[PDB]
C-alpha cells in the first residue's frame, strides 16, 4: 500500500514536470528547427538502418551468466542449513562451473569483438 502510493507520487511528479515543460514556454516550431541533427548537415541515410553489434557473443553469454546470479542469491539462507558440507560442496561446484565456462569462452577467443 505504501509502495504503490510512493510509486504513484514519483510518476505523478515526473509527469507534472513534463507538462510544465511543454505548456509554460513559448513554442515556435518550424520544419528546419525540428529536423534531425548531424552536426551541420542532413543525414544521408536513416537512423533505423541496421547497426552492427560486434559484442553479440558476449551479449549471448551475458544471458547465461545472469541466471547464475539467480542460482547464487539464495546463498545467505542456504548457509543456515544443518548439512553445511553438502551446501558448501554444491555452491563451490556451481561457481567452479561458472569459472570454467568463462575460461572456455576466453581461451576460444570468444571475448574478442568482431572486426
Amino acid at each position: 500500500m505504501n509502495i504503490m502510493l510512493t510509486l504513484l507520487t514519483n510518476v505523478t511528479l515526473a509527469s507534472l514536470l513534463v507538462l510544465i515543460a511543454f505548456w509554460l514556454p513559448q513554442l515556435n516550431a518550424y520544419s528546419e528547427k525540428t529536423s534531425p541533427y548531424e552536426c551541420g548537415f542532413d543525414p544521408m541515410g536513416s537512423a533505423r538502418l541496421p547497426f552492427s553489434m560486434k559484442f553479440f557473443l558476449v551479449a549471448i553469454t551475458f544471458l547465461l551468466f545472469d541466471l547464475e546470479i539467480a542460482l547464487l542469491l539464495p546463498l545467505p539462507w542456504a548457509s543456515q542449513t544443518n548439512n553445511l558440507k553438502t551446501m558448501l560442496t554444491m555452491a563451490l561446484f556451481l561457481l567452479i562451473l561458472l569459472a570454467a565456462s568463462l575460461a572456455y569462452e576466453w581461451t576460444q577467443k570468444g571475448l574478442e569483438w568482431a572486426e
Binding site: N2, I3, L5, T6, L7, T9, N10, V11, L13, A14, S15, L17, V18, I20, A21, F22, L24, P25, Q26, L27, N28, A29, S31, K33, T34, S35, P36, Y37, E38, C39, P43, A47, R48, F51, F55, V58, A59, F62, F65, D66, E68, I69, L72, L73, L75, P76, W77, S79, Q80, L84, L88, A91, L92, L95, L98, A99, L102, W106, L111, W113
Partner: protein
C-alpha cells in the same frame, strides 16, 4: 502523514541534487586553477535556481523523425526511478522497510537503463542510437560483476535487509573485511552511473551529447537531475554497505549526520575522479570488467562463502 514523509524525502533530494551541480562545478574549477560559479548569488549559491528557471522557461522541441510516446516516456521513467531508489535506504530508519531491499534496488537499477535506451532509440538520430548501444554494452559489462559483489559482501550480513547492515557493522566497518571487493564495487558504481572514466552513453567529445542529443529544456533537465540523484543514491548505498555508522536508538540524528557526511565524502570522491582521469574506450571497459573483475569476483565469492563456515561465524536470521 505518510505523504508528508514522501514529500520530505523527495523535495530535499531534488534540492540536494540542484546544489550538487554547483558543488561539482566549483570543485572542478578549483582543481583546474579557476573558481567556478561565484557571481549569481554569494559563492554561486543562486546558480542552480537560475539554471532550473532557464531550462523550464525554454522551448522544448519534438523531433520530426522521433517517436513521440517513448520520447516523452523516457525522462519520466528516469526521474521517477531515481526518486524511487531512495525509499528503502535506512537513515537510520527507511521510509519503506523491505525484507529484500538490496534485490529491490538491483531490479530498479536494472530497469533504469531503459530510459537511456528508449530515449536514444526514440530520438531517431544517429548519435542517439550510438549512445543507446553504448548503454547496452555498459550494462552487459558491469551487471553480473556488480550482483556477485553484492552477494559476496552480504554473505557476512545474513540477509538482504538494508537496516541489518547497521547491526552488522556495530564494531567495525565492513570494508576492513572486504576492501578488495569494495574497490571493485566502487568502480562498478562508476560504471553504473555512467560517470567518468565511463561516461560513454553521453560521450561529449565523441558523440556530441549521445543519447540525449535531441533533448532540450525540461526533459533534458529531468535527465540531468535523474543522473545526479542516482550518483547521490549510489554513494549513499555504498556508505551504508561498507562504512557502518554507529546508531543509537534514542538519538538517530547522530547516525543521520554520520551517514550524510560519509555520502558527501564519496560523492566528492566521484567529482575528484572525474577531474583526474581520461575516458575509457567502451570495449576496454568490457574487457576490464570481464577479464579482471569477473575472475577476482568469482574467487572472492568462493572465499566469502567458505570463510564463515571455516571460522564458525555464520550470521543469524535465515
Amino acid at each position: 502523514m505518510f505523504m508528508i514523509n514522501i514529500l520530505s524525502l523527495i523535495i530535499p533530494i531534488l534540492l540536494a541534487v540542484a546544489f550538487l551541480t554547483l558543488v561539482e562545478r566549483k570543485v572542478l574549477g578549483y582543481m583546474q586553477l579557476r573558481k567556478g560559479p561565484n557571481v549569481v548569488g554569494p559563492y554561486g549559491l543562486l546558480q542552480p535556481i537560475a539554471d532550473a528557471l532557464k531550462l523550464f522557461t525554454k522551448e522544448p522541441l519534438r523531433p520530426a523523425t522521433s517517436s513521440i510516446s517513448m520520447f516523452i516516456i523516457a525522462p519520466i521513467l528516469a526521474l521517477s526511478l531515481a526518486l524511487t531508489m531512495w525509499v528503502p535506504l535506512p537513515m537510520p530508519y527507511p521510509l519503506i522497510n523491505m525484507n529484500l531491499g538490496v534485490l529491490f534496488m538491483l531490479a530498479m537499477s536494472s530497469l533504469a537503463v531503459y530510459s537511456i535506451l528508449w530515449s536514444g532509440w526514440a530520438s531517431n538520430s544517429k548519435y542517439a542510437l550510438i549512445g543507446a548501444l553504448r548503454a547496452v554494452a555498459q550494462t552487459i559489462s558491469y551487471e553480473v560483476t556488480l550482483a556477485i559483489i553484492l552477494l559476496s559482501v552480504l554473505l557476512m550480513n545474513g540477509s538482504y535487509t538494508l537496516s541489518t547492515l547497521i547491526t552488522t557493522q556495530e564494531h567495525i566497518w565492513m570494508i576492513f573485511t572486504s576492501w578488495p571487493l569494495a574497490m571493485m564495487w566502487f568502480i562498478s558504481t562508476l560504471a553504473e552511473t555512467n560517470r567518468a572514466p565511463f561516461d560513454l552513453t553521453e560521450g561529449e567529445s565523441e558523440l556530441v551529447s549521445g543519447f540525449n542529443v535531441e533533448y532540450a529544456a525540461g526533459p533534458f533537465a529531468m535527465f540531468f537531475m535523474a543522473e545526479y540523484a542516482n550518483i547521490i543514491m549510489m554513494n549513499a548505498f555504498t556508505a551504508i554497505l561498507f562504512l557502518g555508522a554507529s546508531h543509537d536508538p534514542h538519538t538517530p540524528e547522530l547516525y543521520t549526520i554520520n551517514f550524510v557526511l560519509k555520502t558527501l565524502a564519496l560523492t566528492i570522491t566521484f567529482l575528484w575522479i572525474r577531474a583526474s582521469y581520461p575516458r575509457f574506450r567502451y570495449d576496454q571497459l568490457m574487457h576490464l570488467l570481464w577479464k579482471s573483475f569477473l575472475p577476482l569476483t568469482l574467487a572472492l565469492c568462493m572465499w566469502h562463502i567458505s570463510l564463515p563456515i571455516m571460522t564458525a561465524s555464520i550470521p543469524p536470521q535465515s
